Amino acid sequence: PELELKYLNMMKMAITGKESICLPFNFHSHRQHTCLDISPYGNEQVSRIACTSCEDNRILPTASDAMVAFINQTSNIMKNRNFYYGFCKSSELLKLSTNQPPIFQIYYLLHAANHDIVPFMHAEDGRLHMHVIFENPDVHIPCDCITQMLTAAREDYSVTLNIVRDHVVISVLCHAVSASSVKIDVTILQRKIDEMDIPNDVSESFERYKELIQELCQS
């Protein structure tokens, strides 16, 4: 007889809330309090209200937490190593990123949720773009994560989730570079990136995607 409230617990059962999405999916078409779970069953949009493929009680960093991380890039090089491998050792692309904090911010937010991601960097017309490649086909983007990505990008970027080569890619496209309100010491960052050893397997991974990277590198 320890159950009087054992039947009252489920104060809110949730099943109905899902919906199918059409690709290429532009993140401007968000649904306020919903997520994105991409599986082989199809592409859908389910709310935290309904979705229990969630961070039980685990918290996610805000766009602000990502900006502070951006400001402290130089201190956390080896933590953010995956991000920097995306520049393919290119130093021009690196100084471009120091002018565009949302590029790092969006990666920081995406990495926080999904750790198994491959970022790639490209530039046209003097603006930096980013393509995040998902290793697993069991893609899931939490609501909190998406909301923060929309805060990080806002008026300048076109974040788009699309599936090619039976894999998922989020394409961050910079349409304008309205000047940043902060500045990173670039020279310190650039010397520290040259100090980094590019591991064979990490460099071999790119050539496993080079049949696909150039296809995305048309913007």
Residue of 142, 157, 174, 209 that binds Zn ion (CB under 5 A)? 142
Residue of 27, 38, 43, 51 that binds Zn ion (CB under 5 A)? 51
Phi, psi for residue 4 in degrees, rounded to 5: -40, -35
Residues within window 154-213 making contact with Zn ion, judged by CB under 5 A: none
> Which value, in Å, is the radius of gyration of the alpha carbons in the chain?
19
Answer yes or no: are the C-beta atoms of 174 and 157 closer than 8 Å: yes
Q: Residues 6 or more apart from 145 whose CB is under 8 A from it?
A: 60, 109, 110, 112, 113
Query: Is 34 a residue that touches Zn ion (CB under 5 A)?
Result: no
In order of 134, 153, 156, the CA distances from 173 in angstroms are: 17, 10, 8
In whole angstroms, how close is the CB of 143 to Zn ion at the nearest point?
6
Query: Is 35 a residue that touches Zn ion (CB under 5 A)?
Result: yes
Nearer to Zn ion, 53 or 74 (CB): 53
Question: To 10 degrees, what angle do helices 63-71 and 101-113 make?
Answer: 120
**Burial (CB count <10 Å: 0-12, 13-18, 19+), residue 115:** exposed
What H or E segment, with its residue span, contains residue 163? Answer: strand 157-164
**Candidates 33-41, 62-70, 71-79, 198-206; binding stretch for Zn ion (CB under 5 A):** 33-41
Query: Is 119 a residue that touches Zn ion (CB under 5 A)?
Result: no
**Candidates 21-29, 51-59, 72-80, 114-122; binding stretch for Zn ion (CB under 5 A):** 51-59
**Candidates 12-20, 67-75, 137-145, 180-188; binding stretch for Zn ion (CB under 5 A):** 137-145
Nearer to Zn ion, 144 or 209 (CB): 144
Both tokens of 112, joined, read: 């926080």
Q: Which residue is nearest to Zn ion (CB)?
A: 35
Residues in the chain: 219
**Candidates 17-25, 27-35, 90-98, 200-208; binding stretch for Zn ion (CB under 5 A):** 27-35
# residues contacting Zn ion (CB under 5 A) = 3
Query: Is 149 a residue that touches Zn ion (CB under 5 A)?
Result: no
Nearer to Zn ion, 138 or 156 (CB): 138
Binding site for Zn ion (CB under 5 A): 35, 51, 142
